[PDB]
């Protein structure tokens, strides 16, 4: 379809069960939640879509809300690309924003294998790092900074294919705000102390490559260490090795695209901005990768 579509909030309500909170196996339409609204499987021109319910579910006001309701329509409509993800549209009339469907749902599910789907090949994992790169170069060629670049924002088509999603907080381009949003557990030091720079989407994506290589989540507060960064330090401090963290839920990886792959995730995780390899060095070093 070559259109955005205006939907009634009644045909979301409709399409969605009314907006059935249930999961997904017990006859709901409940898909997932992030920090700006519950995301609903719908049904509309015996096409399945996905529908973002939108709610300050996380620290932000209702003015903020809307505010990124507006940037999301305005930087999705700019942004089309094969690794981005797909808005078809969107209803405000109770905000809602209406995607393409992603049927393997985000990298995050897809390493903790929620719902019991089978763990994904290091083959695979390779090819999603390379996708979700090429997806934040298109964004940073087109003078876009993320902002909150996460395996739970970094969708699966029916291919598998890297779809990155989240554009509400995204910014068109180093200026500092007063207003310091994202996740933590994913978030480059500058970012944290308010600075607004692509080199702060290097790092999140940094701690997404050890998220692919460990299978571990970022941050887990009954883990030790919690945060997943910490074993950059572990690793170059010779108590750990990238092997004794290394899924154990792959049977494919190599000990060589694995180096290469933790290599490419360390230089991201450079806590000196300006030492990172910028997104178009990093797209190279993972297509050297599986060269
Ligand atoms: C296997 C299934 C069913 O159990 C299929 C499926 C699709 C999506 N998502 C979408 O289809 C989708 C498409 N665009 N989009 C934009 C933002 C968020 N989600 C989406 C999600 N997400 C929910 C929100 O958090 C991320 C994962 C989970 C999921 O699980």
């Given at each position: 379809d070559?259109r955005?579509?205006s939907?009634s ?6 399409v ?14 409940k ?9 609903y ?7 399945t ?7 300050a ?7 903020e ?7 999301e ?9 094969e ?13 809602c924003?209406?995607?393409?469907y ?5 990298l995050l ?6 719902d019991g789907?089978?763990?994904?090949s290091?083959?695979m994992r ?5 996708g ?5 170069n ?8 993320h ?5 739970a924002?970094?969708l ?12 509400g907080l995204?910014?068109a ?8 949003v ?5 978030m480059?030091?500058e970012?944290?102390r308010?600075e607004?720079?692509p ?5 999140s ?7 692919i ?12 260490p919690q945060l997943?960064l ?5 690793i ?5 090795t990238?092997?004794?963290?290394i ?5 494919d ?8 792959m933790?290599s ?5 995780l ?9 997104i ?5 070093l993972?297509?050297?990768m599986?060269?």
């Amino acid at each position: 379809d070559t259109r955005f579509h205006s939907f009634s909030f009644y045909e979301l309500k409709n399409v969605t069960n009314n907006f059935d909170e249930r999961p997904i196996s017990v006859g709901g339409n409940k898909m997932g939640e992030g920090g700006f609204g519950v995301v609903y499987k719908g049904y509309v021109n015996n096409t399945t879509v996905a529908v973002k319910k939108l709610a300050a579910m996380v620290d932000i006001t209702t003015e903020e809300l809307k505010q990124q309701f507006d940037q999301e329509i305005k930087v999705m409509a700019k942004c089309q690309h094969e690794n981005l993800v797909e808005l078809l549209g969107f209803s405000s009339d109770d905000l809602c924003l209406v995607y393409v469907y992603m049927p393997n749902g985000s990298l995050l599910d897809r390493l903790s294998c929620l719902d019991g789907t089978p763990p994904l090949s290091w083959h695979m994992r390779c090819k999603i790092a390379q996708g979700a790169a090429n997806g934040i170069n298109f964004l940073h060629e087109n003078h876009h900074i993320h902002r909150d670049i996460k395996s739970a924002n970094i969708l699966l088509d029916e291919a598998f294919t890297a779809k990155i999603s989240d554009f509400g907080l995204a910014r068109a381009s180093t200026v500092m705000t007063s207003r310091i949003v994202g996740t933590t557990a994913y978030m480059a030091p500058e970012a944290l102390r308010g600075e607004i720079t692509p080199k702060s989407d290097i790092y999140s994506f940094g701690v997404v490559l050890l998220e692919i290589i460990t299978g571990l989540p970022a941050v887990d507060e009954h883990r030790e260490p919690q945060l997943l960064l910490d074993i950059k330090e572990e690793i170059e401090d010779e108590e750990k090795t990238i092997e004794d963290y290394i899924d154990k839920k792959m049977n494919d990886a190599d000990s060589t695209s694995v180096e290469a792959m933790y290599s490419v995730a360390s230089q991201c995780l450079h806590e000196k901005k300006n030492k990172r390899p910028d997104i178009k060095k990093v797209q190279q070093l993972l297509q050297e990768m599986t060269a």
